[PDB]
Amino acid sequence: DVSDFTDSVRDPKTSEILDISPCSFGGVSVITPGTNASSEVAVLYQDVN
Amino acid sequence: TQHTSSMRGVYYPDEIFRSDTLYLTQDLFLPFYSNVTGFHNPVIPFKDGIYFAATENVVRGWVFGSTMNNKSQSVIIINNSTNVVIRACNFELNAFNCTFEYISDKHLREFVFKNKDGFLYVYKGYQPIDLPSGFNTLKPIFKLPLGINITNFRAILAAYFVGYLKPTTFMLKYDENGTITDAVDCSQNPLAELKCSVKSFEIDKGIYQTSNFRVVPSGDVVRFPNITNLCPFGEVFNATKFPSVYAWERKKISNCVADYSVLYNSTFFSTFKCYGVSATKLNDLCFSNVYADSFVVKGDDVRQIAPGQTGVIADYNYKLPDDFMGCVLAWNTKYRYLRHGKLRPFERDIQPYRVVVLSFELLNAPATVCGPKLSTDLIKNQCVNFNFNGLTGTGVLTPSSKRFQPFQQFGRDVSDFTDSVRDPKTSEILDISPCSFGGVSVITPGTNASSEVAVLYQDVNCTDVSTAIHADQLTPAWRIYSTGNNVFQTQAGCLIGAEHVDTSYECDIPIGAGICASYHTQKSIVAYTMSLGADSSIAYSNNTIAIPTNFSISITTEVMPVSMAKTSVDCNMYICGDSTECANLLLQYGSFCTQLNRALSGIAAEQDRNTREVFAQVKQMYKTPTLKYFGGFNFSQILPDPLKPTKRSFIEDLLFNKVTLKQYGECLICAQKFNGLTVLPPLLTDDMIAAYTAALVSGTATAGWTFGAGAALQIPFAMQMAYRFNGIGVTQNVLYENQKQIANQFNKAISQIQESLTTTSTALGKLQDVVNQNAQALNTLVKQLSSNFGAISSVLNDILSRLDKVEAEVQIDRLITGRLQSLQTYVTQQLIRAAEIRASANLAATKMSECVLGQSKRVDFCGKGYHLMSFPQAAPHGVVFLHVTYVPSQERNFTTAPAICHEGKAYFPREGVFVFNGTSWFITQRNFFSPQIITTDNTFVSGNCDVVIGIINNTVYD
Amino acid sequence: GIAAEQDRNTREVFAQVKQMYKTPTLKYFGGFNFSQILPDPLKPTKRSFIEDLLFNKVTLQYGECLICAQKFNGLTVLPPLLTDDMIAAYTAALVSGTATAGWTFGAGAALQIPFAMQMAYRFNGIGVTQNVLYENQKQIANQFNKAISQIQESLTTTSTALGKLQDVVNQNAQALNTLVKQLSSNFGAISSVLNDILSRLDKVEAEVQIDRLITGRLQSLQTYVTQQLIRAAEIRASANLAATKMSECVLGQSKRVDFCGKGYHLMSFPQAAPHGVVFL
Amino acid sequence: LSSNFGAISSVLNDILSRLDKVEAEVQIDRLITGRLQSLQTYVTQQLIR
Amino acid sequence: KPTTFMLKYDENGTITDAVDCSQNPLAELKCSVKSFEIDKGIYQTSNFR
Ligand SMILES: *[C@@H]1O[C@H](CO)[C@@H](O)[C@H](O)[C@H]1NC(C)=O
Ligand SMILES: *[C@@H]1O[C@H](CO)[C@@H](O)[C@H](O)[C@H]1NC(C)=O
Ligand SMILES: *[C@@H]1O[C@H](CO)[C@@H](O)[C@H](O)[C@H]1NC(C)=O
Ligand SMILES: *[C@@H]1O[C@H](CO)[C@@H](O)[C@H](O)[C@H]1NC(C)=O
Ligand SMILES: *[C@@H]1O[C@H](CO)[C@@H](O)[C@H](O)[C@H]1NC(C)=O
Ligand SMILES: *[C@@H]1O[C@H](CO)[C@@H](O)[C@H](O)[C@H]1NC(C)=O
Ligand SMILES: *[C@@H]1O[C@H](CO)[C@@H](O)[C@H](O)[C@H]1NC(C)=O
Ligand SMILES: *[C@@H]1O[C@H](CO)[C@@H](O)[C@H](O)[C@H]1NC(C)=O
C-alpha cells in the first residue's frame, strides 16, 4: 500500500492468497454524571462493531 | 532507416502486486516517441540498455560482448528447436575459459536487455499484428549473474528495431486487477510534468507551479598564485638533531609548492591524525603559511599531545589549542617537573619517539603555500565553476567597483556569502553573482479542452532563457519542446507559448502585474492586459433627476462553509504500530500524544458548536403547510414534498448531488487501516439539519418576521410583502395593484435558479475547496510514512527482524523523530484552518439572524438590491442563502426644483421630489414614478422665497 | 496559498463597481469643492493630490525586479495582480459616482441627482428637515471646504497617522531579516559554510556536518511559514472589515453608531494608500 | 522539564556533576533539543489563542 | 578589555563610527535594535542576574 504496508500475501505451501487486516483498536471515552452525583459511568468504545 | 517508438517498452518495475494506484518510479525506461533504428549484421552498441523488437524466424538469439574476439568473455543466447541455451565462454566469432552455462526445456516479439551490478535482466512481451503504434507491457523472464561488460551486441539469423534506454521517471497506472494499463513520461512536455506533479491524468484550468529551473555552468576557472619553488620538507623531517620537549623549535614554511603526498603514501609514520582537515583533501586547499614544531618525546606520551589533554607535557611543556586546524606526525626512533601554573597554548618556557606538528594559517592574508594545481584564464559574463585559492563555488564573474585595501583578499555579506574577490594574478576585483534560477509555472486551459500549455519562467530576463534553451543548458530540459516565436516579457518573468493581443477582456487566468491569459480564437492561448470594467458616462446637471418607472425581482445565492471533517489519530499506531520497543523509546519524550489528542479533540467539539450556532436558531418546529401556494407565490421547490422518501426539498437534492467527494478508516459495517487515522461522525445528521431549514422556511411563509423576536403571529402573505415594500421605501398600493406581476417574477426567478443549478455550473466551489484541502492534508500525512529520515528502511518490522537491538535503537530513534515532526505539522495547520472555518460560521449565523429572521437595511449585506426576504437551504458542510431583492429598471429624465413658492412662502416636499411632467409640476416618490398633485397635505411651509437657490413659482392646491 | 489570498483581498475591497464613471470636467457642485479628491487632467499621474501625500508618507536583501537581479539565499518578492494605477482608477470611479449619482448605484443602475438635493436627503436621513440644508447651504459648503483643507494640512504636517501600514512593512521586513540571519549559525557543525565543509573534509564526515546544517535550516524555514500563516489570517480579517465599510459607508448611509466616523454619518470617500485604504 | 529525551537524566546538575565534559556535551545536547522544541510549541499555540 | 562593539562600515568600506555596547543602557539598546537612532517607547533589551 501507499504507506509501504503489506496487505496481502501468497501462502508458500498451498499458494492461496491471504488478506491482512489490523485487529480492533480505537479510543475509549468515559461518560459520567459528576462524581458528587454518582459513582457509576458508561464507556463508549469508539468506531468498532 | 528511422522510425518512432510511440509508448512502447514499458515493463513491470518490481515484483509486488498493486491495484487501482498511480505509481511513480525511477529506472531505465525507453522514452516515449524516441528514435529507433530499422534494419531491413552490424556490431551495434549497447550503451545502457536496448529495446529489441522483431516483427518476423529470422531472429533466434543474440551475442553480447566487449571486443567480440577470443580476448574477452562473451555470452551467447540462442534458441534451438525446443531448447534455450546460454553460455558465457571466450569465443571465436572454440571455448577457452568459461564459468556460466544454462540449458532449459505476423507476430511481434519485444525484449528489454538491462545490465547492472553484474546481473543481466531480461524482459519479454508478445503481441500479434514498420513498428506499430501502441502500448504493451513486458514481464520479466530471467536475470543472470554473469559479470562481464557489455558494450556491443549482434543478432543471429531481417526486420528488427533497436531503441535505447535512458534514466527517466514514469508514472505508471495500475488496473482494478494488477495490470499496468497506462503511463506518462514525466519529461516529454511541460504538460506531462504537470500530470506527474499533481498525480492525475486529467488537469483542470488555471496556473500551477511544478518545479524550479536552473542555468547550468559552461566552463571552469582555476586561479592560483605565482609559486614555483618546491617545498623544503626534507630539512624539517629528515633532520639529525631535534630539541627536547621543553625547548621545542618552530620553523616557518612559506612561498613553496607543497606536495603533502610524500607523507601519507608511506608507512614510515606511527601516528597520522588530522584535526579540521582530512589528509586526502590537502592537495587542493591552500594556506597562508605553515609552521612546524620539532621535538622529541617519550613512548606513552604521544597520546598526551592532542587538543585538550592533561599530564606533564600537556601542562608544562607543550600545549595545543582547542580549535586546532593542522596535524601531527610521530614515528619511532628532558622536560619540566616543577612549575607554578599551566602554560598557555603554543607558548614555551626556557622507547623514544620523534614528532612534528603542522599548523595551517587559513587565508587571512595572501596565500603562499599552495598545492600543485594548474591555472586557467578568466571567463567573464558567463556561468562557470570557479576556484580561487581553494575557495570553490559556481556563478558568474563581472568587473567590480569596490576598493579593497591592500590586506583584504575577499568580501562578505550578511548571510556569510562571498560576493567579491581579488584575482591572485592580475589583482583586479571581480564580482560574484548566482546563475539564473527561479520557479516554473504551467498555464493550461484544461485537458478536456486542449493539450497546449504556456510556460512562465518567473523573475528572470529571458534573453538569458532563450539563449540557455537554444544551447541546451537549462535544467528542466524537456525533450519534445520548442521555444517558438512567441516570447513576451512581463514583470512576473517571461511567457513562452502565449501571444500578445491588444484587446482587453475580463481576467481569466491571472499571470501578474496587469497581465491575464485566456483561451480564445483555431483556438490559441492569448495574453492581454485586463480591463477593469465596462464603461459609462453619467451626466451631472444641476436641475435634472432620473426616476425609475418599473422594477424587477431577482433571487441570488450565497454559499457559506460552516464545518469540516472531524478527525482523530492514534499516536502509538501511527508512530509505532504493534511494536513494544518503539513504545518504550517514545515514552522518553513526555506527553506529546496526550497533547495531540487534546488538540484534535477540541477542534472536533468546535465543529459541532459551529453547526448548532448556525442552524439551531428556532425554538419551535413549525409544520410545513399542506398547501404551498400563498397568493400566487409558488413555494413548491423550497419546501419538502410528502410523497417522496427523503426529507430534503428539490433544491436541497440538487445541492447534495452537486458536491462530489476516502479510504482512511471511518465507520460507514466498517473497516480500519494500519495508519491509525479515523473520521468521527457529526452530532446532527442530514435529516435534522433539513428539518431545521424546513421549519425556518415554513415559519417565514406563515408567520413572517415576528417569530424571530418573541412569539409567532400569523399574517397573509400579500400583507407581509406589502409591509416589506414599505420597509424599502415604496408604498403598499404598488404591490396591491401589481400583485400578479410580482408573483410571476418570483416564480420565474425560482425556476431560473433551479435550472442554473441543474446546468452543472460550479457555484458550490467553496464547499468543494473545504473537501479538497482536508483530503490533501491527510494524503500528505499518510505519504510521510514512506520516508526513512536517514534510517536504512522506512519499515519498523524490517529493522526489527534484520538487526540486533543495539542498532535497532538508533534506527528507530531516527524514525520516531521524523514521524513526531510530521504529526506536529499536521496538528498546527489544522488549528489555523479551524480558525478560518469558525470565522465563516460566525458570519453565516449573523446572516441567518439578520436576513432570514428580519429585513436588513445594510447595503449589500444580503443580496445586491433592496432586501425583501431570504431562504435557507442546506448544503454539504455549509448553507446556501437565496436572497430575494428589489431592482428598479427603466429610468426617465425630469426637471426638478428644491422648493416652490406660492404666496411669499416656501414649500418643501414631505417625502419625495418635485418633478416636471412636461406639462405641469407634480410630486413623486424617489423609487417609483407615481405622480401626485401638489397640495398642503404633502408639503410644509418654512420661511419666505428669498433664500433657497433655485426656487420656482407654482400654485399649491388646498 | 498566502500569495493568492493577498490578491483576493485587494479584489474584494476595491472591485465593487460594475461600471467606470468618468471624472467630471467641473469639480464644484453647489459650492462643494472636490478638487483635492479627484485626479487632475493636467498631470502625468492618475493619483489625486491627497493620494500623492499618502504615497509619500509611507517609507517602503532579496531578489525582485521591475533589470532583474537575484540573491544567493533564494528569496524573492512577487508582484501584485492590480497595479497602483488600477487601484487609483477604482477609487476615482467611486468618488465620481458618489458625486454624480449619490447612493443609487450600489443597488442597480446609477441615476443622476444634483448634489444639494442629495445632501438634503442625507440631512433628512439623520433626522433633520431639508430646509435646514437649503437655507444654510453656503455655511455648510464653507465648513466642508475648510475641513478638506485641514485634512490636507494635517497630512502634510508629517504626523504618523499612517502607523498601521508602516507596521505591516516593518513586520514583513524583520521576518525576512531573521530568516537570512539564521544562515550564519552552524547548529553544531564545524562551520556554517557548506563549501568549506565540502572542500576541507572527506565524504564520511561531511555527511555528519551536512546533516546538522540540513536539520537546522529545515527548522528555520518551518518557523517562517507557520508565522506567515498566522499573520495572513490577521490581514484577511482586516480586509474583510474594509470591504464591509466600503459597502455600507461609501455606497450608502449607515445608521450604526460609531461605525463610520464619530457623529451622525452623512457621506464617505475612499483614497488609496500603499497596502491599504484610507476612508475620509 | 521532567523528561530527559534520551539522556541519562532530566537534571543538568547530575549530568554535570557525575560526568566528564566529553560525554556531558552529548547529554546536554539531547536535553537542549527537547526543551527548545517544548518552548517553541508553547509560543505557537499562544499565538493562535 | 573583552567587550562587544557595533562597527559601522562606509559605502567605500572604511569604519567610520562605532558604539561600545557595555557603556550605558542606551548603547546596549542601540546594539540590540541594530541602529544608531532610536525612536520613542519602551524596549526590552536583556535579562539581569
Ligand atoms: C583460462 O583462463 C586462464 C586465466 O583465467 C588463462 O591463463 C588460460 O590461458 C585460459 N585457458 C586457455 C586454454 O587459454
Ligand atoms: C608568564 O609569567 C607569569 C608570571 O611570571 C606566570 O604566572 C605565567 O604562568 C607565565 N606563563 C604564561 C604562559 O603566562
Ligand atoms: C603572475 O604570473 C603571470 C603570468 O602567468 C604574470 O602575468 C603576472 O604579472 C604575475 N603576477 C604576480 C603578482 O606575480
Ligand atoms: C414592467 O415590466 C414588466 C415586465 O418585466 C411589464 O409587463 C410591465 O408592463 C412593465 N411596466 C410598465 C409600466 O411598463
Ligand atoms: C408550483 O411549481 C411546481 C414546480 O414547477 C409545479 O409543478 C406546480 O404545478 C406549481 N404549482 C401550481 C402551478 O399551483
Ligand atoms: C403630463 O401629464 C398628463 C396628465 O396630467 C399626461 O397626459 C401627459 O402625458 C404628461 N406629459 C407628458 C409629456 O408625458
Ligand atoms: C478648489 O480647491 C483648489 C485647491 O485649494 C483651489 O485651487 C480652487 O480654486 C478651488 N476651486 C474654486 C474656489 O472654485
Ligand atoms: C569614498 O571614496 C571617494 C573617492 O573615490 C571619495 O570621494 C568619497 O568621499 C569617499 N567617501 C564616501 C562616503 O563616499
Numbering used by the authors:
A (entry chain A): 554 to 602
B (entry chain B): 31 to 70, 78 to 93, 96 to 132, 155 to 166, 180 to 203, 208 to 235, 250 to 425, 439 to 455, ...
C (entry chain C): 751 to 810, 818 to 823, 832 to 1045
D (entry chain A): 948 to 996
E (entry chain C): 258 to 306
Which statements did the authors publish about this structure?
RBDs in SARS-CoV-1 spikes were observed to be in the “up” and “down” positions making the spikes exhibit open and closed conformations, respectively. We introduced these three disulfide bonds in equivalent positions in the SARS-CoV-1 S sequence generating three spike variants: S/x1 (S370C and D967C), S/x2 (G400C and V969C), and S/x3 (D414C and V969C). We determined cryo-EM structures of SARS-CoV-1 S/x1, S/x2, and S/x3 spikes and we identified various previously undetected conformations for SARS-CoV-1 S through classification procedures.
Previously, we and others found that low pH was able to convert a closed/open SARS-CoV-2 spike to locked conformations.
